[PDB]
Design a protein around this ligand. Structure first.
Ligand code: NAG
Ligand code: CA
Ligand code: CA
Lengths: 82, 83, 196
């Protein structure tokens, strides 16, 4: 809850700005997040989690049709209830 | 989005925003470049090189001179000192 | 005149050539020592980079990238790695003996690594004020090792090493309030005696 300043680098997470746009790097944990001025979340994620992750950005597999596997794990046709 | 999504694949595009009549928003002094290096040579920087072999990232950045100094683009002549 | 020696005793401490212990908890990458200093060719550019090392703990695995003869050999995580071999391989040498990684690079340069954190570079009589960085200048004068990159002595080392970070946009460290007890030993007088 304590508002901190920026940049900020605690716990292996470097919270920096790049090209006038804000970045959060987690290279130790294998990800890079950022935001632009307009507000557009982006997540670059390492192939280590190939076939492993599952969330709102779908699984990091090759296929692009099966990546609605719910928190239980259910291929749901709907992009909404998912 | 379509610009970046192609760029991530290994094939980048260029100057498409020139005629699109839409540039992404950025603060004063900068506007949207495409494929600027992340290691923006700023004002209060050490002049070292060939460590920043990172991939190239899109975003807005200063003009050719006009080094960065605290979130704005300021001319290289007026680089301050710090103590 | 004898052969001086930097050191990193623990996680965040630094001993200069002329001999000056000072405290500097950092998390960015920093210029430990180099030759490219003012009006010199700039042969070698030993660097150091720590991560999660403002507070010493089981965290803070160091990274070290040493830049000599246009090469890129670096180390961390127990082993050393050649990212770019250098030209004059004749001077190159690695002596993995005992607990250390003894590492020569030339006539007047040698590095030692405990495999864990310590960085003990050894320079010969050659230089005698031809270097600068976090270890000072190697001049014999012991109270001018805090000559920041903007060419002035600073009194407070936490501001000093901030002048020697590579990425000029990462997070510079914070001026800690001074006390005799670190965070755990703070108001833990019992433990504070047992550690003592
Ligand atoms: C993903 O993991 C599952 C379960 O271990 C395995 O059956 C499947 O072959 C894996 N698929 C890929 C693309 O690695
Ligand atoms: Ca998928
Ligand atoms: Ca000195």
């Amino acid at each position: 809850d304590q508002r901190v300043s920026m940049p900020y680098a605690s716990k292996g997470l470097y919270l920096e700005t790049e090209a006038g746009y804000y970045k959060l790097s987690g290279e130790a944990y294998g990800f890079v997040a950022r935001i632009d001025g307009s507000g557009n979340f982006q997540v670059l994620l390492s192939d280590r989690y190939f076939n492993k992750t599952c969330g709102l950005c779908g699984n990091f597999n090759i296929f692009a049709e099966d990546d609605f596997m719910t928190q239980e794990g259910t291929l749901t046709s709907d992009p909404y209830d998912f | 989005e379509y610009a970046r999504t192609c760029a991530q694949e290994g094939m980048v595009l260029y100057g498409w925003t020139d005629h699109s009549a839409c540039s992404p928003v950025c603060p004063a002094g900068m506007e949207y470049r495409q494929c600027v290096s992340p290691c923006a040579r700023t004002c209060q920087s050490l002049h070292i090189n060939e460590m920043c072999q990172e991939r190239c990232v899109d975003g807005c950045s200063c003009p050719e001179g006009q080094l960065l100094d605290e979130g704005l683009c300021v001319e290289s002549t007026e680089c301050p000192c710090v103590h | 005149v004898c052969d001086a020696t930097c050191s990193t005793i623990g996680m965040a401490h630094y001993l200069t050539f002329d001999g000056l212990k000072y405290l500097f908890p950092g998390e960015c990458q920093y210029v430990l020592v180099q030759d490219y200093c003012g009006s010199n060719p700039g042969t070698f550019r030993i660097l150091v980079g720590n991560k999660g090392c403002s507070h010493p703990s089981v965290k803070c695995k160091k990274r070290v990238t040493i830049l000599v003869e246009g090469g890129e050999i670096e180390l961390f995580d127990g082993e050393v790695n050649v990212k770019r071999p250098m030209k004059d391989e004749t001077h190159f040498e690695v002596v993995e003996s005992g607990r250390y990684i003894i590492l020569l690079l030339g006539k007047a340069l040698s590095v030692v690594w405990d495999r864990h954190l310590s960085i003990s570079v050894v320079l010969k009589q050659t230089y005698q004020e031809k270097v600068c960085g976090l270890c000072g200048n190697f001049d014999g004068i012991q109270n001018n090792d805090l000559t920041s990159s903007n060419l002035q002595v600073e009194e407070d080392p936490v501001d000093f090493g901030n002048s020697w970070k590579v990425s000029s946009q990462c997070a510079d460290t914070r001026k800690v309030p001074l006390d005799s007890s670190p965070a755990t030993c703070h108001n833990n007088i019992m433990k504070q005696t047992m550690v003592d």
